[PDB]
Amino acid sequence: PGLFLTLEGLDGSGKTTQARRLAAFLEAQGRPVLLTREPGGGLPEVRSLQELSPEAEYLLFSADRAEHVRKVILPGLAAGKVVISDRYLDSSLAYQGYGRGLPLPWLREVAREATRGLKPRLTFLLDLPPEAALRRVRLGLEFFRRVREGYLALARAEPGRFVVLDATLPEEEIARAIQAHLRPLLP
Amino acid sequence: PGLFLTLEGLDGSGKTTQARRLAAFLEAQGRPVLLTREPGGGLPEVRSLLLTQELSPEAEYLLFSADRAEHVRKVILPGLAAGKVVISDRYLDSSLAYQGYGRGLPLPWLREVAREATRGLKPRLTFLLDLPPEAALRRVRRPDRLEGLGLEFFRRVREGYLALARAEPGRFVVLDATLPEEEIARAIQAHLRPLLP
Ligand SMILES: [Ca+2]
Ligand SMILES: [Ca+2]
Ligand SMILES: [Ca+2]
Ligand SMILES: [Ca+2]
Ligand SMILES: [Ca+2]
Ligand SMILES: [Ca+2]
Ligand SMILES: [Ca+2]
Ligand SMILES: [Ca+2]
Ligand SMILES: [Ca+2]
Ligand SMILES: [Ca+2]
Ligand SMILES: [Cl-]
Ligand SMILES: [Cl-]
Ligand SMILES: [Cl-]
Ligand SMILES: [Cl-]
Ligand SMILES: [Cl-]
Ligand SMILES: [Cl-]
Ligand SMILES: [Cl-]
Ligand SMILES: [Cl-]
Ligand SMILES: [Cl-]
Ligand SMILES: [Cl-]
Q1: Distance (Å, rounded) from C-alpha B41 to C-alpha B67?
Q2: Are the beta carbons of B67 and B39 closer than 8 angstroms?
Q3: Chain B interface includes A63 (CB < 8 A)
Q4: Strand partners, A126
Q5: Are A46 and A125 in contact (CB under 8 A)?
Q6: 8 A C-beta contact, residue B91 and residue B124
Q7: What angle do CA B92, A69, A161 make, to 5 degrees?
Q8: How far is A52 from chain B (nearest CA, A)?
Q9: Coiled-coil region(s) at which residues (chain B)?
Q10: In a mutagenesis test of the B interface, which of A55, A102, A115 is the best target, namely the one with the most B β-carbons within 10 Å?
């Protein structure tokens, strides 16, 4: 049956590179795969959009996420695909919750119906310090620290789902680790 | 400072007319007014996004909510701090009536979401121009967003609005939208006189 996976981290963590490495690996094995991303995977018009309150930003991204789940991810899963999302709800929680200081219970209330309760089977978190991530792809430092630390809090709360990787390791070692975590899940 | 007023009802009820007439009346009395509306007062592009084919009711609500959240923070609250009478043609009640009662989204979820989205801001008074849905639907076409919903949808909306008004009778002023336009304007203005003064 289908398998829902996500990739998470700061921009410049290697999250996107790894998403593509994992899709390409599944394609090479002949395993049906759907690579997608947030924001934009549900309502592309939300993505290109742009001076908002973080409450409005979160709601807009939730609307996108609601369509993404219903129109893209769930159908992919019903088809038996490995659906890989570059960013999902954890991004909003980390950035809007821990970063901007929006209340986590509200964020989660909104999410319950936006996602219809859909959670990924595994989430690969490319963890590194903001300074390293900024070097790699160019608000400020203290904000990105709160985001980084929020992701780690999420990972501690849901240790079965999160796979925390040192995003400073060589790409290839990371890719191989991700493949190793996936291998037993693939029929 | 300031005074927050809203108008609500089915399209064709006359709430748009009345909001405009009320603004012009208060302007004639020398009062600063901000006449605004939803959807679009916060994020004008939500109007376009609302015309996505087969949009889930959840996403439609969240779109309205994003618009409202920005509406409140960038338009309504600044206007109120500036002493203005801010009049919105549609606010939270429209979401509750249309996406809740009409489309069937769970009301407690809508309320949970709205509590932060709106920053807890409620209008001082809300003028609900009530009439039967069949009567509304003869007056004017439905917005593009709502093309291909039937009478029973609009009945559930009409009835939702009345339910909201029963629960908050101090905020809602329910008016018969089948009275003459001048009588409705008179009534709205009479409700407002003791406040403005
Ligand atoms: Ca990270
Ligand atoms: Ca990358
Ligand atoms: Ca990978
Ligand atoms: Ca995730
Ligand atoms: Ca969400
Ligand atoms: Ca209508
Ligand atoms: Ca009107
Ligand atoms: Ca009036
Ligand atoms: Ca709105
Ligand atoms: Ca209202
Ligand atoms: Cl899954
Ligand atoms: Cl990245
Ligand atoms: Cl999740
Ligand atoms: Cl877990
Ligand atoms: Cl109207
Ligand atoms: Cl008048
Ligand atoms: Cl709302
Ligand atoms: Cl309200
Ligand atoms: Cl009529
Ligand atoms: Cl009340």
Answers
A1: 7
A2: yes
A3: yes
A4: A165
A5: no
A6: no
A7: 115
A8: 7
A9: none
A10: A55
Handedness of CA B18, B24, B29, B33 (dihedral sign): positive
Cβ of residue A77 closer than 8 Å to a chain B Cβ? no
Q: What share of chain A is helix, strand, coil (3-state, %, to 5)?
A: 55, 15, 30
Which parts of A are annotated binding residues? Answer: 9-16
If we measure between CA atoms, which residue out of B158, B162, B77 comes closest to residue B123? Answer: B77
Per-window interface: B 151-190 vs A, CB < 8 A: none
Helix or strand run (H / E) with residue A108: helix A104-114
Whether A49 contacts chain B with CB within 8 A: yes
Tell me which chain A residues have a C-beta less than 8 angstroms from the C-beta of B119.
55
For chain B, the C-alpha Rg in angstroms (whole number) is 16
Could you count the other beta carbons within 10 Å of the beta carbon of residue A78? 10
**Method underlying the structure:** X-ray
Q: Check CB contact under 8 Å for A45 and B42.
A: no
What is the CATH code for B1-197?
Answer: 3.40.50.300
Q: Where are the alpha helices (DSSP H) in chain B?
A: 15-28, 46-49, 57-70, 77-81, 92-95, 107-117, 133-139, 151-167, 181-192
Q: Which of A52, A63, A103 sits opposite B59 (nearest CB)?
A: A63
- State how far the Cα of A43 lies from the Cα of A45, in Å rounded to an integer: 5
Q: Which residue of B has its CA nearest to A70?
A: B56
**Architecture category of domain A1-187 in CATH:** 3-Layer(aba) Sandwich (3.40)
How remote is the CA of residue A89 from the centroid of ligand 11, in Å? Answer: 15
Q: Find out whether A148 and A10 touch, Cβ atoms under 8 Å.
A: yes
CA distance B53 to B38: 20
Ligand 8 midpoint to CA B187 (Å): 8
Place of tokens 């996936």: A182
Tokens of A83: 């659906």
Q: Provide the resolution (angstroms).
A: 1.8
